[PDB]
Ligand binder design. Structure first.
Ligand SMILES: Nc1ncnc2c1ncn2[C@@H]1O[C@H](COP(=O)(O)OP(=O)(O)O)[C@@H](O)[C@H]1O
Ligand SMILES: [Mg+2]
Lengths: 586, 50, 455, 453
C-alpha cells in the first residue's frame, strides 16, 4: 500500500514520485478521481504515467496508487454480443451505472456480469491428469456457439471435483491438485493483453474465407488465418469492406475493433447486427461478434489498448478451436496514437514522426495471428485472420504504416480514390492489389466446386491486364485505329469490371454472392470472351456481334441481381450466347 | 489526308502540351521533397538538442 | 477563495511562468491582472511542482512581471449557458458584444464537454432538404451529421453556407433550425456577409453567434469553436432544440494551435502542426449527432480553406478522415461561372445510405446518383480528350457523354445561390439530364425502375 | 558480480549505476524480482554508469528489486565443424531440437577487414540452375550479387530455388550454403526450413532464422552471425560457401530502431548516416584469399519500397555489390517464373566465369546475341501495338515472335525446375534458330555452325 504523489501533469502524461515499489507497465489510479492510468517508464523514485482518461483538473500533490498488475482482459461468459471500450468496459452497463448519455471519469466497472447465472455442463471426468488448455466443460452462451472453459496456463494437476450446475464466474466450478498446492478454478480467466497466448505449434492457413465480395474472393483471396491490409484514402470504403466481411464471413466468431474512428460507425453496428441473420449460424450476427469501440475523440492512449484487447479476446476463442476474424479499423490510428506519445516523450522520431519501433510493434500484432493448434493434447486447430484497415495520408502508400504492414502480411487490397470517384465499388485496384495465397486458394476451390476455376481466374485477370495496356494506346492512336479484335477484349473487360467487379453493398441481393453463384458470372463472360474470338476467326464483323451482345449483355448486367437459389438463369443465359453467333453468322 | 491532320494534331499536342507539362511537374515535385526532406532534418536536430 | 499569486517568473510571447504556487490543476482557467488594472484571462497548460505554465488569450503586451499578479479561478474554461443566448452575439470567449442586457446564466459548462456514449448515440437518418441539388441528391446531408465544406481563399464558401443556412428545413416536419455561428479569425467583410444575411432572413432572432475576427487575439480561437459546440449541445440536448453549427474559418483554428505548440517547443508534426492535431480536431467534429430519448439534434457544417488548394495538406486531410464526408469547391468550376462551384466527384457523404430511399425520398434516389457519377466520370474525361484531340476524334457515344457532362455542370450543379430546389424537382431534373443516353449503357439502374421514371 | 543498481528505465533503454570495467557493446543479462531472465547490451557507458538496451523488452520490471550482470564479452558465436544441418536463431541458439553443439572456439561476429593485398580475385563459375542468372548474368565465386524484389514478387521461391540448385562443378571441395533469414513472417520462415529439409539441402546448408517479432537488436546481429559462420567454413575449412540473406530491407528498418534508441539523428530518408558503411561491413566480406582454398559468395535479397531503385536501400547497395538481379511486377503478373527482367539486371564479373574451362566456348558470344535481340524484339512489340501488325517488316515480326518465346520458354523455367548450364546454352541456339543466319553478328564462324540447329 504505497501511495505515490503527483509532481507533474501535462495533458495525458502524469509524473508521480514515491512509486519505487511499483513496476513498469502496471496500471494505476491517478488523482482524487482515481482515473485509469499506466506506468510507461520509471526514473529512480519518480514514475511516468500515461492516462487512459482526460486529466482536466488534475494537479500535483494528489495521490497515485498502483494496482500491481498489467493491462489485462477477462475471458468468460458474457463476453459475446457486447460492445466494450479499449480497456474493456461494458458501455451499456456504463450507461446503466453512470446514468448519463456520456462517458464519465474515474468510474471503475467489471467488464463482465459477475451477478449472472450460467449453466455449466461439465464434460471431463474426475481424477484426470489435465494440463494447460484442456477443456473441462462448456457453457452455451449463444444458441450457435458454446463457451468451452479451459484450464488456465501454469496449471497442471489432477482434477478433484467437478459438476454441472448454475454458477457465476466468481464461485469455484472445479478443483485441481497441483504440486504447488491445491488450486481451484472458475469459469473466468484473466490474461495480459501485451502477451501472446501460448500454443503447441502453428500452421499454414489453407482454407479460403467467404467474404461475399467478388473482387477479393476471386482475384485476391485471404485464407483462414491470413493477414490482409486495406490501405486507402478517406472515402475509399475501408470501413464498408470490413463491415461487409464481418457480416457474411464463413468464420465462427468476429472481433470488430474500431479505434480512433467515428462513433456513428459503431452505433450503426449495434443497431443492425442484432437484426441481421446469416449462416453458418442460424441465429443473429451479434451472437457471433464482439465489439471494441474507441472513438476518435476518446483518450489517445486507449487506442493501443483497444487493438491489444481485441486480439487477446481473439486468441482466447482461438484456443477453443474456433475460427476467428479480427477487424482493426483503423490501424493507422494506433500508429498516430503512438506518434503523439512519442512526441510528448520527446523521443527521437523515425519516418514521418512515427516511432522507430513502429515496424517492430506492428510485427508483434500480426505474428499473434494465423492458424495454430491450442495447448493441452486435444490438439484443436484455431485460426486468427487479420483484416487491418490502413489509412495513409493523401493516399500515398509509401508511408511508414503501410510499408511496415506490407512486410508482414500476405494479402493487400489497395484502394484508390479514382475508382471511388467513378463510384466503382468496392474500389480495389486490381492491377496492384495482390494475394500470396492465390495459388493455394485456387487449388482448394477447383477441388470443391470441381470446375476449372484455377484456369478461369488467371485468364480473367489477363483480360484485365490487357485492358490496361490497351487504353495506353487509345489516348495515342484512337479507338477504331487498330487491333480491332482487342476492342472485344475491352468490351468484355468492360463487363468484367462493371458486371462482376462492381459490387454494390447496398442492394438486398448483391450484398453477398455465394461461391456457386460467383462462378456463373465469371463463367458467362469468358465464354463470350472466346465466343467473340470464335466469330472474328470466321470473319463475322464485330459490330454485328456487339449487337448480339447488347441483346444478351443486358441480361448479364442483371445477373448480379438474380437470387442465389435460381442459378440456372445464369447457367442458361450461357446457352443463349452459344446461340447468337449460330443465328448471327448465317 | 484527313488522318494526317489527326495524327499531326496528336503529335503536336503530345510534344507541346503533354511532355513539357510532365518535365516541369517532376521538377517542381522534386524541389518540394528536396525542401521537405531538409526542413525536417533541421527540426530533428532541435529534437536531438532537447 | 480567492486564489492569487504575485510571483510571475517568466513572460515569453503568449506563455507565462508562475512559480511558488500550490494546488493548481491542469487546464485551469486563470486571470492575469496587470499593474495598470487590466484583466487578461488565461489557461493552465502545464503544472509541475510549485511551478505552472499558462497561455494568455488577450496577449502579454505591456506586462510588468514584478507588479502583476495571477488569479487561479479554480475551474476550467467554461461557458455560461442560457436560453437568452438566442438572438445574442458573443466574442471569442463568450462575452456579450451586442450591448444586450446582462445574462443570468443557467449553468456553467466545461467547454471540453464529454464523449457521447455510442450506445446512447442513435444513428442520423433524417434527410435534410438544403435546396442545393448537388448536396440534397448526390451527396446527401442528414441531421446530426458532421459534413464540412472544403474551399480555398477567394472561393465563395461563405455564400454556400449562407444559402444552406436559410434554405435548411427537413421534410415531414415544421422544425426550423436554430443555427449557431462561430467566426474564427475571419475578416470583417467576410463576417458581415453572414451577419447582414441573417438580419434580412430574420435568422439572427433564431440564432446565437460567437465572433472572433482577424483583429481579435489568435489564442482566443482555441476556445471559440468549443464555446459554440458547447452552446450547441446545450440547446440541442438540455433544451431539445435542433441546432445547425457553422464554423469558419476552421483553418485559422489549426493555425492558432501551431502558434502555442511552437511556443511550447513541442515536437512538431507535419508542416509544424502539433502531433495531436487529429485528436484535437476530432474532439470538435465528433461533438455532433443524436442521442436516445432526446428529441433535439446537433448537426455540424464546418468550413475550411484548403492551403495551397491542396487536399493532401494536414488540415483538409485530417478533417476528411474524421468527418462524415466533405463538400469540395473548385476554382475551375468557380471560374466557369458555376454556382455553387461544387466538384461532385471528390466530394462525399457517408450517411447517404440509410439517409435516402423509400419513405423519405423516391426509390430512384439511390440509382440516379450512382448512374450520374459513372456518366460524369466518363463524360468529363471525354471532354478532356476533346479539347486537345478534337471533337471528331471521339466516338458517337463519347460525344453524347461529353455533351452530357457539360450540361451536367451548367444546370444541375449551377442553380444560383438564391434558388431553392425541392428534392422532387432535383430528381425530375436528374432523369432529364441522363435521359439523353441509350438504356443499354446504363447498367446501374433497375430495369423496372427505369420504365417507371424514364422520360 | 551482480549489481542491484538500476537508476533509470526509459523505453527499451535501461540505466545501471555504480559500475566499473564495463565495455562498449558488452553483453549483459538482468535478473528480475520474479526470476525472469532477460538479456541486454551496453549501448553507452560513462565513468560511473552505463546504458543498456534489453532485447526482450522492459515490461514489468521493478528497478529496486532487480539485478544486472555483466558477462564481460560481446556477441560471440560458437564455431564448430558439426554445424551443418542444424537450424539456429539470430543469436546462434539452436531451433531444431538437436544435440547442442560443443563449439571449437568463440569468435566476434564483427570479424576483421581483409587485407587488400591478401585478396585473390575469383575465376570459378558457379551454377545456380536458373537460366537468366546462369547465362546472361552469370554468378562467379566470391562475387557479391544481390536480388532486387518487391512486396509479393516471389523472391522467397527464388531464394529457395537458388540454394537447392546452387552447386560447384567438378571441384573436389564440398559445398557449404550458409543461409540467413532476417525479420521474416513465420510462414516465410516455416516455408524455407521445410523446403530445405525435403530437398536434402538442409544437410548441405547452415540455417540462421530470425522472425519478425524477434527483437530488433538481434535482427541486426543475424547477418553478422551468418557471415562469421560462412567465414568459418571457407577460410578455416577450405570450403566454397554461398550466403543468402533475406530480408535486407528488414535489416535496415531494425537498424533504424536502435539508432533512435541511441538518440542518433538520421542522415537521409530516415535511415542513419552509417547505412552505406554498415552495409559494406557485412557485404564486402566475400571472395577468395591468396594461399587459401576458401570461397565466400553472397546473394543478398531486398524488397525495394514500391519498386524504386533510387530508394536508399537498393541504391546504396549498388555502390557495394557487383551487379544486380531485378524481379519485375509486370513479369510476375504475366505468369513468368522467375519474373527476372534481364535488361536492367547486371553482373559486373560475368565474363570471369564464362568460356572454355568453366563453360561452353560460345557462352559470351551467345549471351550478347540473345540480349540485343531481346531489346530489338521488345521495340518491335511496342511499335506493333501502336501501328498494327502489318507495319512491321516480317523479320521484325519474327524478332517480336522471338522476344515473347524468349520469355516464355527461356526465362520462365519454374521455381522447382533445375536447368544445367549446357541445357541453357543450346536452348538459346534453339531460340536463335528462329532468326535467320544473317543477323547474328555477335557470333563467329567457329561457333555459329558448330551449335546452331
Ligand atoms: N463497397 C461499397 N459499395 C457502395 N458504396 C461504398 C462502398 N465503399 C464505400 N462506399 C461509400 O463510400 C463511403 C465511405 O465509406 P467508408 O468505409 O467510411 O470509407 P473509409 O473507410 O475509406 O473512410 C460510404 O459512406 C459509402 O457510401
Ligand atoms: Mg472508415
Amino acid at each position: 500500500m504505497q501511495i505515490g504523489k503527483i509532481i507533474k501533469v501535462s495533458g495525458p502524461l502524469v509524473m508521480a514520485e514515491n512509486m519505487s515499489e511499483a513496476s513498469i507497465q502496471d496500471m494505476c489510479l491517478v488523482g482524487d478521481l482515481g482515473v485509469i492510468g499506466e506506468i510507461i517508464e520509471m526514473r529512480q523514485d519518480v514514475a511516468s504515467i500515461q492516462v487512459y482518461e482526460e486529466t482536466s483538473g488534475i494537479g500535483p500533490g494528489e495521490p497515485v496508487r498502483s494496482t500491481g498488475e498489467a493491462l489485462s482482459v477477462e475471458l468468460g461468459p458474457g463476453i459475446i454480443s457486447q460492445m466494450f471500450d479499449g480497456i474493456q468496459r461494458p458501455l451499456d452497463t456504463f450507461m446503466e451505472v453512470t446514468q448519463s448519455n456520456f462517458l464519465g471519469r474515474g468510474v471503475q466497472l467489471p467488464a463482465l456480469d459477475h451477478e449472472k447465472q450460467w449453466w455449466f455442463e461439465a464434460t471431463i471426468e474426475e481424477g484426470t491428469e489435465v494440463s494447460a488448455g484442456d477443456i473441462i466443460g462448456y457453457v452455451d452462451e449463444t444458441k450457435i456457439i458454446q463457451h468451452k472453459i479451459m484450464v488456465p496456463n501454469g496449471i497442471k494437476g489432477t482434477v478433484q471435483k467437478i459438476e454441472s450446475g448454475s454458477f457465476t464466474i466468481d464461485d469455484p466450478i472445479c478443483v485441481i491438485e497441483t504440486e504447488q498446492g491445491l488450486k481451484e478454478l472458475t469459469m473466468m480467466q484473466k490474461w495480459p493483453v501485451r502477451r501472446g497466448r501460448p500454443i503447441k505449434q502453428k500452421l499454414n492457413p489453407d482454407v479460403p474465407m467467404i467474404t461475399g465480395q467478388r473482387v477479393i474472393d476471386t482475384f485476391f483471396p485471404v485464407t483462414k488465418g491470413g493477414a490482409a491490409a486495406v490501405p486507402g484514402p478517406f472515402g475509399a470504403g475501408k470501413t464498408v469492406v470490413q463491415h461487409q466481411i464481418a457480416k457474411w464471413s464463413d468464420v465462427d466468431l468476429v472481433v470488430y475493433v474500431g479505434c480512433g474512428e467515428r462513433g456513428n460507425e459503431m452505433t450503426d453496428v449495434v443497431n443492425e447486427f442484432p437484426e441481421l441473420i446469416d449462416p453458418n449460424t442460424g441465429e443473429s450476427l451479434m451472437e457471433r461478434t464482439v465489439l471494441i469501440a474507441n472513438t476518435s475523440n476518446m483518450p489517445v492512449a486507449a487506442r493501443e489498448a483497444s487493438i491489444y484487447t481485441g486480439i487477446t479476446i481473439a486468441e482466447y476463442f482461438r484456443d477453443m478451436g474456433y475460427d476467428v476474424a479480427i477487424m482493426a479499423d483503423s490501424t493507422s490510428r494506433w500508429a498516430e496514437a503512438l506518434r503523439e506519445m512519442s512526441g510528448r516523450l520527446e523521443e527521437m522520431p523515425g519516418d514521418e514522426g512515427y516511432p522507430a519501433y513502429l515496424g517492430s510493434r506492428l510485427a508483434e500484432y500480426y505474428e499473434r495471428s494465423g492458424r495454430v493448434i491450442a495447448l493441452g493434447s486435444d490438439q484443436r486447430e484455431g485460426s486468427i485472420t487479420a483484416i487491418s484497415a490502413v489509412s495513409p495520408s493523401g493516399g500515398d502508400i509509401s508511408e511508414p504504416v503501410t510499408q511496415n504492414t506490407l512486410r508482414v502480411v500476405k494479402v493487400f487490397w489497395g484502394l484508390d480514390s479514382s475508382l471511388a470517384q467513378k463510384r466503382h465499388f468496392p474500389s480495389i485496384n486490381w492491377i496492384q492489389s495482390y494475394s500470396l495465397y492465390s495459388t493455394e486458394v485456387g487449388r482448394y476451390m477447383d477441388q470443391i466446386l470441381q470446375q476449372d476455376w484455377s484456369d478461369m481466374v488467371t485468364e480473367g485477370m489477363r483480360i484485365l491486364q490487357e485492358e490496361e495496356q490497351l487504353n495506353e494506346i487509345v489516348r495515342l492512336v484512337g479507338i477504331d485505329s487498330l487491333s480491332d479484335n482487342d476492342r472485344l477484349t475491352l468490351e468484355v473487360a468492360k463487363s468484367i469490371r462493371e458486371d462482376y467487379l462492381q459490387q454494390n453493398a447496398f442492394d438486398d441481393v448483391d450484398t453477398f454472392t455465394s461461391r456457386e453463384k460467383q462462378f456463373n458470372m465469371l463463367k458467362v463472360i469468358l465464354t463470350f470472351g472466346k465466343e467473340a474470338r470464335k466469330a472474328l476467326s470466321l470473319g463475322a464483323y464485330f459490330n454485328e456481334i456487339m449487337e448480339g451482345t447488347v441483346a444478351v449483355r443486358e441480361r448479364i448486367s442483371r445477373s448480379k441481381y438474380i437470387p442465389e437459389e435460381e442459378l440456372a438463369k445464369i447457367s442458361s443465359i450461357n446457352e443463349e450466347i452459344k446461340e447468337t453467333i449460330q443465328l448471327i453468322v448465317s | 489526308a484527313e488522318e494526317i491532320e489527326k495524327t499531326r494534331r496528336r503529335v503536336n499536342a503530345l510534344e507541346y502540351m503533354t511532355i513539357p507539362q510532365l518535365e516541369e511537374t517532376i521538377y517542381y515535385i522534386k524541389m518540394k521533397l528536396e525542401e521537405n526532406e531538409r526542413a525536417e532534418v533541421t527540426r530533428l536536430i532541435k529534437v536531438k538538442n532537447m | 477563495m480567492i486564489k492569487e499569486y504575485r510571483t510571475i517568473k517568466e513572460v515569453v510571447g503568449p506563455l507565462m511562468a508562475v512559480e511558488k504556487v500550490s494546488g493548481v490543476k491542469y487546464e485551469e482557467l486563470i486571470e492575469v491582472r496587470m499593474q495598470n488594472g487590466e484583466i487578461r484571462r488565461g489557461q493552465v497548460l502545464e503544472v509541475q511542482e510549485d511551478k505552472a505554465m499558462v497561455q494568455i488569450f488577450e496577449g502579454t503586451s505591456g506586462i510588468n512581471l514584478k507588479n502583476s499578479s495571477v488569479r487561479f479561478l479554480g475551474h476550467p474554461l467554461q461557458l455560461g449557458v442560457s436560453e437568452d443566448m438566442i438572438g445574442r452575439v458573443f466574442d471569442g470567449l463568450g462575452r456579450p458584444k451586442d450591448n444586450g442586457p446582462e445574462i443570468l446564466p443557467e449553468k456553467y459548462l466545461d467547454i471540453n464537454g464529454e464523449v457521447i456514449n455510442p450506445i446512447a448515440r442513435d444513428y442520423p437518418d433524417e434527410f435534410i432538404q438544403t435546396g442545393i441539388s448537388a448536396i440534397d441528391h448526390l451527396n446527401t446531408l442528414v441531421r446530426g451529421q458532421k459534413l464540412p465544406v472544403f474551399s480555398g481563399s477567394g472561393l465563395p464558401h461563405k455564400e454556400l453556407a449562407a444559402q444552406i443556412a436559410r434554405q435548411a428545413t427537413v421534410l415531414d416536419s415544421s422544425d426550423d433550425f436554430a443555427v449557431v455561428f462561430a467566426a474564427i479569425g475571419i475578416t470583417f467583410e467576410e463576417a458581415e456577409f453572414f451577419m447582414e444575411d441573417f438580419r434580412q432572413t430574420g435568422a439572427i432572432d433564431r440564432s446565437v453567434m460567437f465572433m472572433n475576427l482577424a483583429n481579435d487575439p489568435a489564442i482566443e480561437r482555441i476556445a471559440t469553436p468549443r464555446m459554440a459546440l458547447t452552446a450547441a449541445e446545450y440547446l440541442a440536448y438540455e433544451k431539445g432544440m435542433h441546432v445547425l453549427v457553422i464554423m469558419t474559418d476552421m483553418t485559422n483554428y489549426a493555425e492558432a494551435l501551431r502558434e502555442i505548440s511552437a511556443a511550447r517547443r513541442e515536437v512538431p508534426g507535419r508542416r509544424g502542426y502539433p502531433g495531436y492535431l487529429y485528436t484535437n480536431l476530432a474532439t470538435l467534429f465528433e461533438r455532433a449527432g443524436r442521442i436516445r430519448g432526446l428529441k433535439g439534434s446537433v448537426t455540424q457544417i464546418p468550413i475550411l480553406t484548403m492551403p495551397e488548394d491542396d487536399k493532401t495538406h494536414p488540415i483538409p486531410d485530417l478533417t476528411g478522415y474524421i468527418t462524415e464526408g466533405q463538400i469540395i469547391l473548385t476554382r475551375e468550376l468557380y471560374k466557369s461561372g458555376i454556382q455553387p462551384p461544387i466538384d461532385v466527384l471528390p466530394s462525399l457523404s457517408r450517411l447517404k445510405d440509410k439517409g435516402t430511399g423509400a419513405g423519405k425520398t423516391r426509390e430512384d434516389h439511390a440509382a440516379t446518383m450512382n448512374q450520374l457519377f459513372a456518366a460524369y466520370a466518363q463524360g468529363k474525361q471525354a471532354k478532356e480528350l476533346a479539347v486537345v484531340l478534337g471533337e471528331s476524334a471521339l466516338s458517337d457515344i463519347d460525344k453524347i457523354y461529353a455533351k452530357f457532362a457539360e450540361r451536367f455542370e451548367n444546370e444541375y450543379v449551377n442553380q444560383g445561390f438564391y434558388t431553392n430546389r425541392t428534392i422532387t424537382e432535383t430528381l425530375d431534373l436528374g432523369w432529364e439530364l441522363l435521359a439523353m443516353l441509350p438504356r443499354t449503357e446504363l447498367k446501374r439502374i433497375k430495369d423496372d425502375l427505369l420504365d417507371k421514371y424514364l422520360p
